[PDB]
Amino acid sequence: TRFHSFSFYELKNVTNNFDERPIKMGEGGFGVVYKGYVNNTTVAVKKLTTEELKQQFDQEIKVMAKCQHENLVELLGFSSDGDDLCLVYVYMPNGSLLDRLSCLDGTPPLSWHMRCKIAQGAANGINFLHENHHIHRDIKSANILLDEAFTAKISDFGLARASEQTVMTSRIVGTTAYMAPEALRGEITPKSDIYSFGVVLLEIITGLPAVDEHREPQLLLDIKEEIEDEEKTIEDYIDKKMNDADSTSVEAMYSVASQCLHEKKNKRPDIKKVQQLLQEMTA
């Protein structure tokens, strides 16, 4: 795919001079996102070492040219005009799954029905990336965007890798609270995306963030051991901000999350198996 090359000044004009006040959108993928209106459509404009930051910008565009799917955010264009690089996307009115699970800014809690659809859509997006020999490397709820219908859209391909076993790297990247043991040691494999997706499934079931410094356990992945040692059950961790969650489908989602979170990469299910299991949960 070939994208529209936007003018930096057109992007600066439509985003009100890249205003940092709320409604700015968010920040994380080594850049800040801003709202704007261009060519009769609402858009999201990402304003991004200087050389390492350009590699993140080129990688997003390369992966986006090759990867187009109902469950991946669509890139509309970009801006190279100067040295303050901008990426232009289709605007996702419902934000991230992280913000929606936390009910940030007073939004209503997501229902179990909406959560199951989001889990399936996110898994369909990761399946498409793996089928096309791509490793995301930063699967997390902040990187799952939600559109006008709450359809899951995988975002942020700056750290993504092609594969077109297992390779190793010297610059270990990702989000600690979601990373597989092998990814924290420098391995690059699609099995690490499965593990991180298992952490996303625990956030969906519980509504709790992957890490919370004022909590025990501080890391959400540790509830897997508390449940396996029969100290607690998944029912003690279910998000109470839902009225439509039945124990059978919650346990079926938890079983997928548990399998995803296997400490040995070769014992985890592949994305096609995760996708099959999530489809059978609803059906």
Residue numbers of the site for ligand 76Q (CB under 6 A)? 25-26, 29, 33, 44, 46, 73, 89, 91-96, 99, 145, 155-156
**Among residues 115 and 136, whose Cβ is nearest to ligand 76Q?**
136
Task: Output the smallest distance, CB 106 to ligand 76Q, in A.
Answer: 12
Task: Output the smallest distance, CB 2 to ligand 76Q, in A.
Answer: 18
Task: Output the smallest distance, CB 103 to ligand 76Q, in A.
Answer: 12
**Among residues 70 and 263, whose Cβ is nearest to ligand 76Q?**
70
Confirm if 139 and 178 have CB atoms less than 8 A apart. yes
Q: Which of 83, 105, 138, 193 is catalytic?
A: 138
Q: What is the DSSP string of 72-101?
A: BPPEEEEE-SSSS-EEEEE--TT-BHHHHH
Task: Output the smallest distance, CB 99 to ligand 76Q, in A.
Answer: 5
Structure tokens at 249: 């489908």
Q: Is 46 annotated as a binding residue?
A: yes
Task: Output the smallest distance, CB 216 to ligand 76Q, in A.
Answer: 27
**Among residues 2 and 21, whose Cβ is nearest to ligand 76Q?**
21
Q: Is 27 annotated as a binding residue?
A: yes
Confirm if 136 and 129 have CB atoms less than 8 A apart. yes
Which sign, positive or negative, has the C-alpha torsion 97, 271, 217, 207?
positive
Q: Is 239 annotated as a binding residue?
A: no
**Among residues 96 and 206, whose Cβ is nearest to ligand 76Q?**
96
Cis peptide upstream of residue 217 (ω within 30 degrees of 0) = yes
Residue with tokens 């499965």: 194
Q: Is 38 annotated as a binding residue?
A: no
Confirm if 119 and 112 have CB atoms less than 8 A apart. no
Residue 55 Cα to chain centre, angstroms: 20
Is 270 designated active site? no
Confirm if 90 and 74 have CB atoms less than 8 A apart. yes
Q: Is 26 annotated as a binding residue?
A: yes
Q: Is 211 annotated as a binding residue?
A: no
Query: If we measure between CA atoms, which residue out of 235, 250, 159, 176 comes closest to residue 210?
Result: 176
CA 253/CA 282 separation, integer angstroms: 10
**Among residues 93 and 186, whose Cβ is nearest to ligand 76Q?**
93
Cite the annotated binding site by residue number: 25-33, 46, 140-143, 156
Cite the annotated binding site for ATP by residue number: 25-33, 46, 140-143, 156
Q: Among all residues, which ones are annotated catalytic?
A: 138
